[PDB]
Amino acid sequence: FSCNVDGGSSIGAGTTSVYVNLDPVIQPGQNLVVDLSQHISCWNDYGGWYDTDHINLVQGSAFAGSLQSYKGSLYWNNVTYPFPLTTNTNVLDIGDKTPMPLPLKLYITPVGGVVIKAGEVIARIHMYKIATLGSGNPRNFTWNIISNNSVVMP
Ligand SMILES: O=C(O)c1cc(-c2ccccc2O[C@@H]2O[C@H](CO)[C@H](O)[C@H](O)[C@H]2O)cc([N+](=O)[O-])c1
Numbered sequence: 001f002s003c004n005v006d007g008g009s010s011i012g013a014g015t016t017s018v019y020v021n022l023d024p025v026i027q028p029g030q031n032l033v034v035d036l037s038q039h040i041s042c043w044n045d046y047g048g049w050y051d052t053d054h055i056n057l058v059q060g061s062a063f064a065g066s067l068q069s070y071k072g073s074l075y076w077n078n079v080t081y082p083f084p085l086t087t088n089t090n091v092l093d094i095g096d097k098t099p100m101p102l103p104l105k106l107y108i109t110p111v112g113g114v115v116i117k118a119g120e121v122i123a124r125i126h127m128y129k130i131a132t133l134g135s136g137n138p139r140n141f142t143w144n145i146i147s148n149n150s151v152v153m154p
């Protein structure tokens, strides 16, 4: 099982930064929408749904410390969860060799000028993989989400 970010090197586990582009200006009462499906894609390394991979996001996925007061909802594979995650999410099965954009979005409500600083971590999303055959070769991933640009709110 592997993923990449913006079509870069293949990733089988571990921590990777994911750089996003956000609307530079938002109004009071407006949320930021981070569509991670545009950045992270994953696939099964055999194809044909041989040794199908089972992927979920993990309780403890959270905002960056600086943004701890923010509110959020996380969309994963047809379901929306409050963020930070206090439960794991549903499981997404991956079996094609052709990369699948991850069905992952984050909706962020700023609480408490600059609402997002360019270059700062926004959120840390933990992901778990286990496959079907043998031990399933469980793997842990972290996606550290970072904006390329600042966002301001009047
Ligand atoms: O385990 C890894 O860390 C890892 C494995 C592989 C890989 C490459 C070639 C063939 C099979 C591979 O892994 C198996 O894939 C199964 C179906 O997805 C299934 O996931 C199996 O459990 C798995 O062993 C690639 C990378 N990579 O980042 O390019 C990473």
Ligand SMILES: O=C(O)c1cc(-c2ccccc2O[C@@H]2O[C@H](CO)[C@H](O)[C@H](O)[C@H]2O)cc([N+](=O)[O-])c1
Pocket: 056, 057, 058, 059, 060, 088, 126, 127, 128, 139, 140, 141, 142
């Ligand atoms: O090892 C497992 O069985 C397992 C691991 C994870 C996981 C994936 C990604 C990042 C962190 C993860 O678990 C945390 O690991 C901490 C120690 O490193 C620490 O042990 C935390 O308690 C733990 O939650 C998810 C699942 N899962 O089923 O979604 C299972």
